Design a protein around this ligand. Structure first.
Ligand SMILES: OC[C@H]1O[C@@H](O)[C@H](O)[C@@H](O)[C@@H]1O
Ligand SMILES: [Ca+2]
Length: 785
């Protein structure tokens, strides 16, 4: 019933972790290990349900994070054969709400995920065989259903006994209309102890005044709908509705539109647990001050010995507005297929009821090349799908179409701790999945970068790295310089896409990697979507020119190579570099090569300038940095550290079909050293490749941050590089280590930037690990959807 369970992440239902990874800094986010698969489309707002059955992640407010169970949001099962049994399929509340309810025994079945499909298989409690498959229609190359705020729960019931069974399936849900908005928007921005800017989120959690629920009963479908009176027009953030529907004709429908989710639940349970019915209630009286309201329905049916029945239950949520900074209003993409009124949940659920079997067939179809691939291990097939989860839960935005953005604009947060979008350094490896599966979204992201590059905001703001607790005294830099390459596309407390370079940790006006990243991403996106989108190319080309001139100014001595200096000036933003670095120098060489290739196609005059620079810079890079076994960190520090990601530029150059930026034998020697040192002499290869070690496997400084962390996404980029250079076995072994760390130690569906050798993590729900797709791309040959 679970298709290809070996290519799925599995855990017994409600089975926890003895010692899961924990956050390395106490100021940062750690909700604990009970993340399950997120439900809902990209930019739809999403909800997540744990492997214990709890609906515990609430991302209905775009870009905002709420973790916590609403126990009344739950499926419950009744069975009568010889005995009678009924259970709610989550954890017993720790506070004694719903005290009359019984909660399904832990460990009596399996939870399985291959995103966007998940299954609960209950076994050992009911006589019947029961599977709930939960999915949303996440569909590569589909810019419609992939945006939808719907979840399908497909239930399969089989009777293996020779005794007839009566079953009832209940869905209850609390009405949270109006909860998911910020009552303190555009709040004072603090500097956290780590130096990141943060704002205050005060949601209207538990504020249900005016909320009301109604039964839905037509010839085609029945269920309930959750609303609020009055519903303004236009809607504000938080305004909308929920609906859940089943088809008619499957059994006997009981509807109770209004019950009390903070009470003991006995009005429901007294019926349900006894015969599988509910008291009939259609009562749309709006909730009083201080009162919570929930709905429920149940479908009762018989199952003859050997019979098998399916019941599609769909859940939709229409919350059309995403407000960022006060007054900054966007509509969600899915409104392009209904409307912007916030009155369409039944329409979306009805669509889901009609199309769910098509959607499921389509998911099977796009996963089939991955699952059948002869040269990929099962653990990899699983991780390739599962790492996609972040496109839904990473505060994802997908706005309504316009003329200049015909499928909408798109953005994933860097993470929850670092609350800004599509960080350019991070997406250099993080964006490979988006490129492969939603190239139109990928291109919209890069166009947003291109539009921002010529913009400026000269306003001085505090730089977190230097902040010492006194605003008046604190070092400040201009928010953005004209033609500098922004770090990110803004934040959910300000203005995504339009107000860029939000992070204040460093002055990214000074970064020596961003410009080269920009160019490489533009050329990659053009190249890998077939080399025919001349519109994209011509739109980005002025920004390519601006970016390369921006970065050239940091070539102080005129050898052709930009020089690192000052505070950390690249993606390793705790790590000071001095002079030409392997890292930035290499990205620059690849970027020049990219601009030359693209500029030649577009017939642009700057190509000759770039060729001149490249002719000086490429030989000089090797001449300054080759030490005999690897490339030195940088020309100025005198460090002997082997930086794992030193030849990122050579990975990219070869990926883009461009000329090698270094001699190919030196590339392979360096790569061999990195593997043998950063990986095999770091705690014996137990965690993956550390970012920087001495040739003897020791830290240069034992008090360092970045050098001694294993970055998931860097590892996956390194694995792709290994594979590309013919070190196939190495590649699989490195990638395998990192996948096992994530999936075994309680980081599933919140993959972090970093793990340590001390069982800690940094920055859960991170953008970079989607770089697993880069390994898929280099190794997939012909396949991939
Ligand atoms: O983990 C390192 C990352 O830290 C984040 O705070 C930054 O925004 C990224 O630019 C950086 O690469
Ligand atoms: Ca908001």
């Amino acid at each position: 019933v679970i298709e290809f369970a070996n290519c799925a992440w599995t855990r017994a239902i409600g089975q926890g972790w003895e010692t899961p990874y924990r956050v390395r800094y106490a100021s940062n986010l750690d909700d604990g290990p009970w993340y399950g698969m997120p439900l809902g489309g990209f930019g739809a707002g999403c909800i997540g349900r744990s492997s214990a059955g709890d609906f515990n992640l609430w991302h209905v407010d775009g870009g905002e994070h709420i973790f916590g169970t609403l126990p009344a949001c739950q499926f419950s099962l009744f069975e009568q054969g010889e005995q009678t049994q009924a259970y709610a399929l989550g954890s017993a509340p720790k506070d004694g709400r719903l005290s009359s309810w019984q909660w399904y025994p832990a460990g009596k079945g399996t939870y399985a995920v291959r995103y966007p499909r998940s299954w609960f298989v209950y076994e050992g409690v009911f006589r019947a065989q029961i599977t709930c498959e939960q999915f949303s229609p996440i569909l590569p190359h589909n810019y419609q259903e992939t945006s939808y705020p719907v979840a399908v729960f497909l239930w399969t019931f089989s009777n293996p006994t020779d005794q007839s069974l009566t079953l009832s399936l209940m869905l209850s849900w609390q009405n949270t209309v109006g909860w998911f908005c910020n009552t303190t928007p555009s709040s004072a921005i603090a500097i956290r102890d780590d130096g990141s800017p943060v704002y205050t989120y005060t949601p209207r959690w538990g504020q249900s005044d005016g909320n009301f629920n109604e039964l839905i009963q037509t010839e085609s479908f029945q269920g309930w709908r959750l609303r609020r009176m009055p519903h303004p027009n236009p809607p504000q953030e938080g305004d909308g509705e929920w609906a859940a529907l089943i088809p008619t004709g499957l059994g006997e429908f009981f509807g109770c539109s209004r019950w009390q989710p903070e009470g003991d639940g006995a009005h429901l349970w007294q019926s349900f647990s006894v015969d599988g019915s509910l008291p009939f209630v259609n009562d749309p009286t709006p909730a009083a001050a201080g009162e919570q309201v929930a709905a429920a329905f149940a479908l009762r049916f018989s199952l003859a010995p050997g019979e098998r029945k399916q019941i599609p239950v769909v859940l939709a949520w229409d919350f059309p507005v995403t407000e960022f900074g006060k007054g900054v209003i966007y509509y969600r993409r899915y409104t392009d297929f209904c409307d912007r009124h916030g009155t369409n949940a039944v329409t979306l659920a009805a669509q889901a009821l009609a199309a769910y079997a098509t959607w499921q067939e389509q998911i099977r179809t796009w996963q089939a090349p991955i699952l059948s691939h002869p040269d990929w291990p099962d653990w990899f097939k699983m991780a390739l799908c599962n790492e996609l989860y972040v496109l839904s839960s990473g505060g994802s935005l997908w706005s309504a179409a316009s003329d200049r953005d015909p499928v909408g604009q798109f953005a994933v947060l860097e993470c929850l701790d670092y609350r800004w979008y599509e960080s350019l350094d991070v997406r250099l490896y993080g964006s490979f999945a988006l490129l492969q599966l939603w190239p139109e979204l990928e291109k919209s992201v890069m166009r947003a970068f291109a539009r921002a590059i010529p913009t400026a905001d000269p306003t001085l703001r505090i730089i977190g790295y230097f902040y010492r607790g006194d605003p008046e005294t604190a070092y400040k830099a201009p928010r953005k310089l004209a033609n500098a390459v922004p770090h990110d596309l803004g934040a959910p407390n300000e203005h995504p896409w339009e107000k860029t370079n939000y992070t204040a940790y460093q002055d990214c006006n000074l970064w020596k990697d961003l410009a080269s990243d920009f160019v490489l991403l533009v050329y990659r996106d053009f190249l890998f979507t077939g080399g025919t989108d001349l519109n994209f190319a011509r739109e980005c080309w002025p920004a390519v020119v601006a970016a390369l001139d921006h970065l050239k100014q940091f070539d102080q001595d005129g050898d052709g190579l930009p020089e690192n200096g000052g505070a950390p000036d690249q993606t390793y933003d705790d790590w000071k570099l001095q002079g030409v670095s392997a890292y930035c120098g290499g990205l620059w060489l690849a970027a020049l090569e990219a601009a030359i290739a693209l500029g030649t196609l577009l017939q642009q005059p700057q190509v000759e300038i770039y060729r001149q620079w490249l002719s000086q810079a490429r030989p000089r890079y090797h001449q300054l940095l080759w030490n005999g076994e690897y490339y030195r960190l940088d020309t100025g520090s005198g460090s002997d550290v082997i930086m794992a990601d030193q030849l990122c530029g050579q990975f990219y150059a070869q990926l883009l079909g461009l000329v090698d930026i270094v001699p190919p034998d030196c590339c392979d020697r360096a790569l061999r050293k990195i593997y043998d040192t950063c990986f095999l002499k770091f705690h014996n290869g137990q965690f993956g490749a550390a970012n920087g070690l001495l040739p003897n496997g020791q830290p240069e400084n034992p008090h360092a941050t970045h050098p001694l962390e294993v970055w998931t996404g860097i590892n996956f980029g390194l694995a792709a590089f290994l594979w590309q250079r013919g070190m196939i076995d190495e590649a699989w072994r490195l990638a395998e280590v990192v996948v096992r760390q994530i999936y075994e130690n309680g980081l599933q569906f919140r993959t972090p930037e970093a793990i340590t050798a001390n069982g800690t993590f940094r920055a859960c729900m991170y953008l970079r690990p989607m770089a697993i797709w880069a390994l898929a791309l280099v190794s997939g040959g012909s396949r991939l959807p």
